[PDB]
Amino acid sequence: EGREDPQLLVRVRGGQLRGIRLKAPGGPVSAFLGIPFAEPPVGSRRFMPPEPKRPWSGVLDATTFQNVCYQYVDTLYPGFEGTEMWNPNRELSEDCLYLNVWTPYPRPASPTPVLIWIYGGGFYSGAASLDVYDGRFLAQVEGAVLVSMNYRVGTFGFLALPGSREAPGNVGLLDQRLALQWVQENIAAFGGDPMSVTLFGESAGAASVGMHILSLPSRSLFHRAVLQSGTPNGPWATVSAGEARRRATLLARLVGCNDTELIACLRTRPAQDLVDHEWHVLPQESIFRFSFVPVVDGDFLSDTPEALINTGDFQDLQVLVGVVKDEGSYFLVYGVPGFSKDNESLISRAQFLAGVRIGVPQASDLAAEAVVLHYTDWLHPEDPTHLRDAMSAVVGDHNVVCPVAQLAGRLAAQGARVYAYIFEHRASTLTWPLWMGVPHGYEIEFIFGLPLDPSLNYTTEERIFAQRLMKYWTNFARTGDPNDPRDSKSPQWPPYTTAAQQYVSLNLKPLEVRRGLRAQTCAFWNRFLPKLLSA
Amino acid sequence: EDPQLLVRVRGGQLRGIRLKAPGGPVSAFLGIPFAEPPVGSRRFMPPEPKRPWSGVLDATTFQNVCYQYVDTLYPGFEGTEMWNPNRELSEDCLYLNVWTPYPRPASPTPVLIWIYGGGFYSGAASLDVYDGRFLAQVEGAVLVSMNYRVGTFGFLALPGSREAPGNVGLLDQRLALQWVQENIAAFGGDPMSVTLFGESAGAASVGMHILSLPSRSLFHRAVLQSGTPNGPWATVSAGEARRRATLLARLVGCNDTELIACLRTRPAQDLVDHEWHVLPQESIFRFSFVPVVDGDFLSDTPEALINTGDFQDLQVLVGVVKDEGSYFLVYGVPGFSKDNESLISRAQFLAGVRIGVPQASDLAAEAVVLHYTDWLHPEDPTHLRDAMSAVVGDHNVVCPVAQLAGRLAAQGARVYAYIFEHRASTLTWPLWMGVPHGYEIEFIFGLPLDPSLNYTTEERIFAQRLMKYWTNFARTGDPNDPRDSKSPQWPPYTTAAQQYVSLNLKPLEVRRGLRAQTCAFWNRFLPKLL
């Protein structure tokens, strides 16, 4: 070593890392970026569980983000900040199982609460390196240890021939889990308290957090959990073994291919080749069509999440959950005819019924009838502004809001401490049109503290809001309670209960309590609609 | 011999009585025969015109009430007795009543004809709440009301037979309307301006006259208060009527001809004894004998008929009251009584729904419960109680009334719609019933103007106001006072804007959408779910 900054050399079980002292608005942080936690899942290892990373010699350079797992790159709007902000920001490669650690500078003296981020991307995309997941502000301003991992997405992470040796399913979730294991063993080397790990994530990342709550080997690797705009239960986060087998077989044919032979063929296919076909598995017109998601394999998920959230014991569990004001708006522009980022997307009634078939592809004619009926404003059943907004609500309520409301309800009942929010602040910087409101995913930059970077052009009040939110999330990591134990001028955030159904609004104003999470409407999706899908 | 109380009608001479109304005298011709008594071989049969009479017939008193079940659920309770027959029961009952201003109108006066409700199993023109004296006096209206046959006597059909063709109670009504075309001028009435009005089954009857072509030439406007020809309760299929008829016959020990001949031989009270055993089906509206879709009087189900009809030259006033369903709960639904607050359990509510919507399959019941549950207070007994009322009101009245108002407007009528929200200070039902089925009639008819009745001074003004709405509609097709610039004007109900008004103590408020979402549930979804 000799001449290096002594505050930036740490040792983990695999060997020696050298980190980087990064600059944050109000001081420096330590970052150890691109630490490998698994043997690269390439060649013969494709589709297979991750193996722990064999120790290296010398000092690993952990100063830059690593490769991003092979994924489909969105090209709906070339040059558009609104979409590129989510696109990969490092080389694409199957060699991508690396995690990142942010800690205070100097790394803290007493052992600090850890926060682990699991990114979203509908299980087909995502990266711990994206700007909106920068751990530096949470590290610097809250003295938090923050960790985030890459996990395999799309076919590489989730294609399954359930029952087989070669492609058991859920390997993306298993990548995440091995990263949690890595945290237990090694986080202390950085001043992290492995007895205080809160998982947080958004969308498919939230669903991931939910599945760890639901999977036994993984329950011993964290204590608290945050699910933002996602759930393990619901229409898009899982597939039955049979369905997953159908899709895997189908994809195999598309690329030109006894389970051993099939997968052996698949494995001889170039990565890009699989990515080029992963969308053709469901011609089936469908927004939250994505073919490769966690399979209910009777192993990792011993049963469907709905079953498991109904009958598990969550007495020893604190969750924070919530949604943004406009969950579904975003999705409409990706294959509901009539919707665009470039006009005000006022649709016709005809375009609405047509969208309801696309948003709820698993719906009989009677079901679509029901949805349309429930979401039509009969005072103005022809008004395009309302219909546009209805279509958003439908997609939003079906995939996010009511799955979350269900999740909060069951959990609260089965003995958990649940806190619930609705995020209501549209970013002054947002580049999506006004009509989309506060779209899915646009709370992340606030929780991570991005508005504290003067150069990012957020308003002052947004900088105060960011800090407020960050306090909520870290307090929750620390105590299982978002409220401040000291400061009692600020309105309290009450637990969500079955009886009172209370949640709070997150916006530029002080906390306001509300009761019932889209109560009537979620009763429609969660209780009534299923029964209408008995033929 | 007051010559003002003396009239020559086509059948002969009549002598009325002079009646005392608060602000002056009214002429009155009670108990005028409009048909041959429908007795003996004439039971179940179409009414025939009454034969002429020698001398001066005494029309100074109310005639008999048509033979009907008498309510005994709450004996001696004012709430219930006021609906019960207030004269002798008899199958000889086809009489009508005319009220006119005294002295009798100097030029032809618009005529209002009342058709009482009672679910097609009860009711009388002679009840206190249909007293035509105030409308006659205060508004100078010629007001007519008739008895028509009810229950088995009026509605028992063996469709296609010559000897019990069905709908005779409606034909009774039609004949009274014919009688008015032919005789009302003699009272100062204008046969060129006949407005029908009725409540509940009287509303449905009014509606059936709208839908039946011979009736159409006998009136010019209509008011349907809290009832419709469409809906669950007002009509039956030819098939189902024949079933209920033969079942009633079998129940009293009885070929169409031979079956009816046998029924004809039975005392009236025998048929009424078994009237309520034709549908054991523990619903509320288990009344078995209602107008029948006969391909004759009703050329096709009302739904069909309102859907395809042409209502170009028609003005209609329709409305509901705030709490259509509360009244009925205490008759069938377990857990509901006039004597407590009827705060019910959830289980009670789900059982309540299978009763209030007896049509409902498991799923459709699920749907109703689902729709009406307040998922934020899903157990609160106050909500479940109020929900139950709502289920029953909406399904049988509010949504039918909306369905009709929409279709009439769409197909060219001119529609005015209200909701009645004022609870009579003198009501004797408990508070949890709100403003129940039937409790606007007393205001329309002008009862609070009679000081001996203890209605608040505000209520007396409110009644004057409603009497103006109704008679303005009668006079013009428009309820609005044409010497009232200052407004709140009452807007026509159009399918586009969907406006109605609140009838209560505060001045008119225009609201849009008569239970818009809930009635979409009843009218568009639930049908498909079956």
Ligand SMILES: *[C@@H]1O[C@H](CO)[C@@H](O)[C@H](O)[C@H]1NC(C)=O
């Ligand atoms: C906006 O753009 C979409 C997508 O190309 C188009 O189909 C739609 O007609 C446009 N909306 C309107 C009506 O301006």
